[model samples]
Target: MEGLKQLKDLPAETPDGKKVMLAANIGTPKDVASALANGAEGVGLFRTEFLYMDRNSLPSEEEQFEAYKEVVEKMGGRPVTIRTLDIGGDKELPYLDMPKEMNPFLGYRAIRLCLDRPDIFKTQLRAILRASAYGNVQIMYPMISSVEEVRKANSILEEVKAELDREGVKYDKEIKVGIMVEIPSAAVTADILAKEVDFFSIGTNDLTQYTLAVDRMNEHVKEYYQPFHPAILRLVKMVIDAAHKEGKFAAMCGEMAGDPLAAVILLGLGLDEFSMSATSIPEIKNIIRNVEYEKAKEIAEKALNMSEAREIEKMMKDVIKDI
Candidate 1:
């Protein structure tokens, strides 16, 4: 009760009047309600792969539509950003029987798999487009590494729209489309990618793994997975700056977002949004409400000059405690 009481008097918004959105994944109706009740503003990264996993066959359009529709409607008009199915890598569906790859993470997955199997990809897209009519819904493609992939995906989306139009199906014609800037290549070419998409959501998990050359899942290399490393912060700043230059918003949806220290650094780095797990909302909101934007910017600038991740991590911990 003391912990709750301490946060009771915090302001509802940042000093600059910025209402930072706290978004979470939409796992189910219960997850949706729990997230909202915990102070989440909307659904940030809806993992749609759950619909296609552990199934004998791909979910039919109607089945997919129902699942997506329910989450959108339940959001009560809050923004919901749903990522298309991200199969492969550590997540595999036996029915799909995808070839075993020596390096699955770099091999076929997410957008790559969807592009190869347009039939499956279009089904999910149609469902999302249809659900967009029920509420505010935005579509995001994951594991994107190239500008061409964004163009190709957009072309397919256009084709799906034509089919729906011909069949007299009603759907959102102006739904916003975005991509996950997870790969190093994508982050480097973000300015190019920004022009093609409506927004960019940085997948810091994979971005750190790729940038640091560490296997995030491998325990032996776990110590080397430094999220606060100078490279990671610079890349994040680069991507966010690129997005802003193009008049697009950049959001981060990864484990890093939930960290209180990382939140301050990100806030300073000019991130437009922070999307993490539902349970993390209240605490992160408290941090944002208490820290001034200018102070965050000073901390971020200092952290960027640090030589080691440990130094940056220590500085953030010390500064945030005193804030």
Candidate 2:
């Protein structure tokens, strides 16, 4: 894990001699697994927004359905977590017609934007729900800040299910509902949200941005993106604590979970799962299997004692030692 250069260097194949689980960030065909032969674990982030990206206008439910079904069929029986279409001020979707705002981060986004346009939201939900019948599928909503949003989204989902039932369309009625707890508001209120949702996936990318008021996408300052920063670490710790308190699993799919140094640090923080690109799966797994969880916890404790980002960064470097 320490010196591994790339994913191809790891033992991606299964014990019986098949490739291990390989995942793609966006829409990936099932044939992708055949390229590995060892069965893939499943899709990590099924970003449905791509269905509408780079298009002339809104995509019809039927069109989305075909694309989703193709992906499911391609993967065979692997599980897939299809996140609902998340478009906001950060993204430039021509058809959305959202008004410009002074603070886009706190403005029209994810669940907020979707709730305003249920027609658009329902179309994607309907497509995802329909695709569930083709494979193991879970439904996730992004940028959820409160329990009210989760409840409202689920209520709307039920309505879509009713329509599907009436139309005799086959679908998975008991799809697992989860949320991306990236906002400070959501992380601190996880006790309430954990009760409302089945699981939690922290979007570290956005969490870092909002926590530090630093835009990672901005070229000039993006290089300063640091996951081990005090504020970011504290926010993550709060969310993980809340989720575990409610007897729910918390996973970190953000870049923090994938970093060479941050990987063990997060595992020490008691993260239930580390979701990253298929290419990094082996090294991450290697890191987890080799390191003592208690040692990582100690590192986390020491990290908490530090205040400055540089101190924390240096602490992590020392813990990794070989790095």
Candidate 3:
């Protein structure tokens, strides 16, 4: 049965007992309800940048805390990965002094802007740290390429934690943190970055964008924006393998994770978590429950050997039909 009610309670695991997490990518706190209804084990990617947008002034610390707090409490102890202000580039606020750029996508954005503006970064970090006391909460920084970016961001995080302690604030002392691996350098150097974080959330959309030099937003070059390209598949494999070698989890928050055929391949590649929007959860869960881990790994191997993108997807389609 395709009925979500039937799929909701079922675990996203294989018959051979290889279990993977099916998580949700939420924009704001209210999305928690949909995540729970759709059977998300946790919040994998929380885009906190939305709060800073659509307003003249930045959200206050208490405002951000309440928003993060509500989502954590609503998840009922489920892990929540909230990303700090991933703004700049195409996402500049009207009030901010973000400069113009030739290539905004590759320009200063996400964690880059966050590190440069501690006034904004610290506000959000404090909010996230304070919200940790409510339940399971992890901090994720977007657009992370080098270890220094993570170190600098965590430096500010330490400052915020010290400030909270001085103010007698209560929060989780041991919260997890991670980065979005969208840059090619991040993927190739994943082993180095894996040592610095708790997890890695691969952003295939941008990884394809930067690797292939295709403007993912441009309709004219849409054909060039390959998701399952051999290059991308290899990069994904590299990222996943590096994480495992370093004893960290590899998660995918890209829309590619929701693709049925891609899900099978990702599972085979040993991707520990699949994070996407709420509605697609059951569909991915259904596929996960129907297949065996060993076969998935075999299918994944076949996929990697094939060089053509369409052919790879076609092979996956054929394999899934039989399942």
Candidate 4:
């Protein structure tokens, strides 16, 4: 408490003075208190599955609006990224008529579900937009694979904005919109998608699953699921580089950001925001404050050049072993 405690109230910055935001991944408005208590700079992942699930045939726009507004208000205008419905596949809603599938993960889910159900998507979009007037709110679409999906989603959002305008509703016209880079396709095509979206958030779990073709839940393949593999690092680097190249910020809500050793490498890789459970930020913050941006970059470069995940993991562990 004494050692890491001093780091909590300080800004998450490198020794060279470049600040990387430390945010939290929350499930609802209820989590904001812990987030603030833990010194979250903003909310990076607001997986709003709470509103859509548990006895519902798609929540009303008004219902969703209140939820979003409450969070934005509680966060005191800090950016709240309300991730659009990532329901489907194994995460099924009994009320909906979502068909069973052999592989729901790769099959219809998230944006695929939202895109097809415009009524469901539009209502939630409007609420997020409506809540924008309350605080710094962003709309993040999940499972974005191709550029066309991004275009289609944006086009739909355009319609929603127009509807709001005609209704004379109050909202932030300049509210930011972003996508989750969970798919390998999105990771590789970051250069293209980066041109369209306001920001990018890496969902490392699915990216690792889809990239490595290993089932994260399958016991036989648990060893195969590695987030620090060379390919994963390159993809991570590609997305971060692409975001910065386009003058946009990149965030990660992955557990990787919460790890003390991994936090050092990500700091080196120029990640703009780190979001994990509120309790996890302190340790990572201590790690970031002790390292220099220049050295982090060099370490990141060398890690990218290496081949194995365990090797990279060990190197990072040794890198911050004392700190």
lDDT of each: 0.85, 0.74, 0.90, 0.88
Q: Please give, for residues 50-99, the per-residue lDDT of candidate 4 as tens digits.
A: 99777757788999999999999999878999899987768768777887
Candidate no. 4 TM-score:
0.97
Q: What is the per-residue lDDT of model 2 for residues 63-140, given as tens digits with 9 covering 90 to 100?
A: 988888877777677666677877776677777777788777778877888898999899998988898888777787
lDDT winner among the candidates? 3
Residue-by-residue lDDT tens digits, candidate 3, 106-144? 887888888888898999999999999999999988898
- Candidate 1, 1-323: lDDT as tens digits: 12544543343366776556778866555578777666667787888878887778889999999989999998889888999988785676777768889888888888999999999999999999999999999999998989999999999999999999999988888899999878899999998998999899888888999888888889998999988888889899999999999999988888898888898888888887788887777778788887788888888889999999998888888977786
Give the range where candidate 3 is weakest over 10 consecutive residues by summed lDDT.
88-97
Error of 1 at 196 (Å): 0.6
Candidate 2 residue 158 C-alpha distance from true site, Å: 0.9
Error of 4 at 49 (Å): 0.7
Ranking by TM-score: 3, 4, 1, 2
Off by over 4 Å in 3: none
Candidate 2, residue 301: Cα displacement in angstroms equals 2.6
Estimate the overall C-alpha local distance difference test score of candidate 3: 0.90
Give TM-scores for every candidate, taking all chains together and pairing residue i with residue i: 0.95, 0.86, 0.97, 0.97
